[PDB]
Structures are given as C-alpha cells and as structure tokens.
Paper text:
Here, we identify an evolutionarily conserved hexapeptide sequence as the major aggregation-prone region (APR) of gastrointestinal peptides of the glucagon family: xFxxWL. We determine nine polymorphic crystal structures of the APR segments of glucagon-like peptides 1 and 2, and exendin and its derivatives. We propose that the pH-dependent changes of the protonation states of glutamate/aspartate residues of APRs initiate switching between the amyloid and the folded, monomeric forms of the hormones. Our results highlight the dual role of short aggregation core motifs in reversible amyloid formation and receptor binding.
Crystals of APRGLP1 grew only at a low pH (pH ≈ 2, T = 37 °C) where the N-terminal glutamic acid self-converted to a pyroglutamic acid (pE) via a spontaneous ring closure. To avoid this side reaction and study the effect of protection of the N-terminal, we synthesized and crystallized its N-terminally acetylated form, Ac-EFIAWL. This compound showed similar spectral properties to APRGLP1. In the structure of APRGLP1 the hydrophobic residues (Phe, Ile, Ala, Leu) form a hydrophobic core, while Trp and pGlu participate in H-bonding with each other and water molecules. A similar interface can be found in the structure of its N-acetylated form. The presence of the acetyl group and Glu instead of pGlu resulted in a lateral shift between adjacent β-sheets, allowing Glu to form H-bonds with waters located near chain termini and Trp side chains from neighboring β-sheets. The fact that this structure also belongs to class 7 suggests that the hydrophobic residues are the main determinants of the topology of the nanostructure. In the crystal structure of Ac-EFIAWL, the interaction between Phe residues from neighboring sheets is made possible by a slight shift of the sheets compared to the structure of pEFIAWL.
Residue numbers in the entry:
A (entry chain B), B (entry chain A): 1 to 6
C-alpha cells in the first residue's frame, strides 16, 4: 500500500 | 508532504 499527500 | 508505504 502506497499513500502520498502534498 | 506525507508518504506511507506498508
């Protein structure tokens, strides 16, 4: 599982 | 920035 937030 | 890898 990958999560990115900017 | 936030990143998660599980």
């Amino acid at each position: 599982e990958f999560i990115a937030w900017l």
